[PDB]
Design a protein around this nucleic acid. Structure first.
Ligand SMILES: [Mg+2]
Ligand SMILES: [Mg+2]
Ligand SMILES: [Mg+2]
Ligand SMILES: [Mg+2]
Ligand SMILES: [Mg+2]
Ligand SMILES: [Mg+2]
Ligand SMILES: [Mg+2]
Ligand SMILES: [Mg+2]
Ligand SMILES: [Mg+2]
Lengths: 151, 288, 95, 54, 52, 55
RNA sequence: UCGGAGUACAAAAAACCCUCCGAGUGAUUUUAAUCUAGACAAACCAGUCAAAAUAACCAUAACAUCACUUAUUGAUCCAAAAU
């Protein structure tokens, strides 16, 4: 039953009861982005370099926690990593601890949803690797320019 | 069992007369006698070496010595004052619980870790305590109330996920010494000293709920604690509704060394009694 | 080096070593390059870099420095925030 | 092209990378002499501390 | 003729210095150098005289 | 040193598995260590000689 | 003490109170960054090159140049500077 001048109650008068710290403020964050129960989370453990592939799969069209405009823009930007069964698939590699991997996946997802839910995204493209693309495009467009109907 | 025994019937008594050191145990020493080991006796010929006088160790023969031509640079600079936290992986903690060295039932602090010999602290070497590292995070299934002096985010998360509680507490050198080896302290015949505070450098560490600091504001605790669960993607259990919860919330006073004892008491171990000061000044001092 | 001290009868350390080198736990010693603070305006950028390095000592020097240094300096240290903790163990060394 | 594999050939769609060979490092030496500290990182397996018995 | 070692300072407001050998009988030196902090090619003017 | 606690499931999280109820029929036996582990150790000599001891 | 040629005829190294030339810096503006695979050389200390990658600038812009270019140099400590 010991107490000191420096004890936890007299330092912070406002909160006292021993159950104060363990309260759960589910009202504080009601957003609950990424309801992890709704994701398929796979662990491929590669030991030898030691790294654990962690994978996050979910159906994009069937995912209701994301708005419709966002759910449609995602299927545009990320269609490369979408699967023929309609599954969006994220993958992380780096750490040997799959906590860190899962965290990387979830952060990736958060960021994708973030940039897709922003209408202000201008999708700015660099001219470094795309110079070849623009020039070879233009130059296949010089040939494509022949006009007579066919078929 | 040992078929060797059956041979021992056949042979004469083992006595002092017949005893052989294990072969190879004693490499016989050799003396400078005789043709081989005599006549200059391994010392060479004239010079400084046969006479025994060759110079000291670092000396290169007068050219500026190697160990002195290299410039001084703080490497070991102020090393004696750096803080040292003996690491404890979740792997070892789990292995310790599994074999029932430490029991997860009662709260786990430094003294419990020492008593299981899961860890060893030597305050004289400026060990400030145990730090928790994440080595076994993925495999860690036990549910614990643990108190260490430093911890990593991943370690903490790994303990929360299983519904336990981590807290980072500070001990000063004297405190720490007493905490690791209590029974030799109680034979000392001294009161139980106050636990000192952290110095100015370590205060911002122990005041943050980020670190589950023992000096932190418990208002922030559930918030940060939930933030962890967002980041590592697991459902945060309600510790409140558990049956062992009374043990899980257990703290120490920031000024208190042990669980259930108090600064200024005296443990008489021959009578199995505690002695407490009734004086006003003493009680003011120890309780401040 | 003093092999047997007078008061304690123990073996002393040569501090002049402790000031300029750093012993990893593997047994590797680490040192600064010589003349790295000296006359910088007169030197190439490349050379300047070659000087700014931290480098390893060859075996002979390592044994020498070990002999000049007591056991305390070879203990396994865990420092908080330590830059060099990363480097104390050796990995994948096939010998 | 994505449409082809799924719709016509009734396949999953194979995707490839361009993989360059891992960089060549000399045999590691017990006492690397006059080598920068970062030497020890070239033979490093993965960047993560590992506390062996600890 | 002797030359001189002068300390030269950035006008970028970043404290940054580099020393240069410059002719003794010549004018106060001014150059365009590289400042690492601002990561730019900026103007350096001689602040001080270090060595002779 | 405490005898290990009985569990409901083997092997344990740390991978520790107790010895069997009977002992095998082999004409040799390997005791557990005082810490209840299997006594197989590795040893080096001269820095290059790697050995494995069964005790 | 440092460099070039011979001695030392063709990979390297190679001595003499051996034979001969030099160096202890000028002049100039193109003011010549950071980081790092791999190597040369080597008793040690010191020396040398250098891809990729960053950042600087044409907006995919990193070898200061000339004088036989090679040599124009000096460790720790300690002092002055304050970055
Ligand atoms: Mg003898
Ligand atoms: Mg003899
Ligand atoms: Mg004789
Ligand atoms: Mg004689
Ligand atoms: Mg002689
Ligand atoms: Mg220790
Ligand atoms: Mg051994
Ligand atoms: Mg060679
Ligand atoms: Mg380049």
């Amino acid at each position: 039953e010991f107490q000191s001048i420096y004890s936890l109650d007299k330092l912070y008068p406002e909160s006292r009861g021993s159950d104060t710290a363990w309260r759960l403020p589910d009202d504080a964050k009601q957003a609950n982005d990424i309801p992890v129960d709704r994701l398929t989370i796979s662990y491929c453990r590669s030991s030898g370099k030691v790294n654990s592939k962690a994978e996050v799969r979910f159906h994009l069209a069937s995912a209701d926690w994301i708005a419709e405009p966002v759910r449609l823009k995602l299927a545009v930007k990320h269609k490369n990593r979408i699967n023929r069964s309609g599954e969006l698939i994220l993958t992380s590699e780096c750490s040997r601890y799959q906590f860190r991997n899962l965290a990387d996946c979830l952060q990736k997802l958060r960021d994708m949803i973030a940039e897709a839910s922003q209408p202000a995204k201008e999708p700015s493209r660099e001219d470094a690797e795309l110079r070849r693309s623009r020039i070879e495009n233009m130059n296949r467009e010089r040939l494509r320019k022949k006009r007579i109907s066919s078929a | 069992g040992p078929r060797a025994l059956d041979l021992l019937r056949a042979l004469p008594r083992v006595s002092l007369a017949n005893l052989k050191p294990n072969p190879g145990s004693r490499k016989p020493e050799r003396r400078p006698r005789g043709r081989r080991r005599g006549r200059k006796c391994g010392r060479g010929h004239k010079g400084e070496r046969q006479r025994g006088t060759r110079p000291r160790l670092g000396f290169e023969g007068g050219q500026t010595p190697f160990y002195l031509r290299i410039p001084k640079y703080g490497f070991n600079e102020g090393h004696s004052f750096r803080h040292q936290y003996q690491p404890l992986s979740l792997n070892r903690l789990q292995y310790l619980i599994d074999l029932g060295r430490v029991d997860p039932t009662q709260p786990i602090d430094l003294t419990q870790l020492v008593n299981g010999r899961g860890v060893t602290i030597q305050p004289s070497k400026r060990d400030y305590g145990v730090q928790l590292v994440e080595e076994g995070a993925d495999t860690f299934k036990a549910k614990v109330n643990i108190e260490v002096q430093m911890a990593s985010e991943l370690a903490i998360a790994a303990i929360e996920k299983n519904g336990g509680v981590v807290t980072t507490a500070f001990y000063d050198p004297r405190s720490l010494e007493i905490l690791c080896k209590p029974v030799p302290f109680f034979l000392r015949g001294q009161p139980i000293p106050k636990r000192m505070l952290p110095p100015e450098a370590l205060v911002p560490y122990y005041t943050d709920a980020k670190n589950r600091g023992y000096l932190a504001d418990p208002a922030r605790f559930p918030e940060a604690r939930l933030e962890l669960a967002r980041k590592y993607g697991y459902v945060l259990p309600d510790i409140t509704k558990d049956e062992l919860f009374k043990m899980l919330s257990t703290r120490k006073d920031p000024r208190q060394i042990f669980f259930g004892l108090a600064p200024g008491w005296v443990v008489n171990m021959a009578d199995k009694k505690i002695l407490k000061p009734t004086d006003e000044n003493l009680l003011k001092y120890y309780s401040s | 080096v003093t092999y047997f001290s007078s008061r304690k009868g123990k073996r002393k350390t040569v501090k002049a070593v402790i000031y300029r080198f750093l012993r990893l736990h593997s047994g590797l010693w680490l040192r600064r390059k010589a003349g790295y603070k000296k006359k910088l305006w007169k030197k190439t950028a490349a050379r300047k870099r070659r000087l700014r390095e931290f480098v390893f000592c060859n075996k002979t020097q390592s044994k020498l420095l070990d002999k000049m240094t007591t056991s305390f300096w070879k203990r396994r240290n865990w420092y908080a925030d330590d830059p060099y903790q990363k480097y104390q163990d050796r990995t994948n060394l096939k010998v | 092209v994505t449409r082809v594999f799924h719709q016509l050939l009734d396949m999953r769609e194979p995707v490839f990378e361009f993989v360059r060979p891992p960089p060549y490092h000399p045999k590691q030496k017990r006492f690397p002499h006059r080598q920068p500290l970062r030497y020890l990182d070239r033979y490093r397996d993965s960047h993560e501390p590992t506390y062996g018995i600890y | 003729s002797k030359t001189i070692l002068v300390k030269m300072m950035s006008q970028a407001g970043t404290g940054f210095s580099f020393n240069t050998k410059r002719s003794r009988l010549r004018e106060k030196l001014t150059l365009l150098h590289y400042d690492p902090v601002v990561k730019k090619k900026v103007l350096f003017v001689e602040q001080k005289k270090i060595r002779s | 040193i405490p005898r290990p606690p009985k569990h409901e499931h083997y092997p344990t999280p740390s991978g520790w598995q107790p010895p069997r109820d009977p002992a095998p029929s082999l004409p040799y036996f390997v005791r557990r260590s005082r810490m209840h582990n299997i006594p197989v150790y590795r040893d080096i000599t001269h820095g290059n000689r790697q050995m494995t001891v069964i005790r």
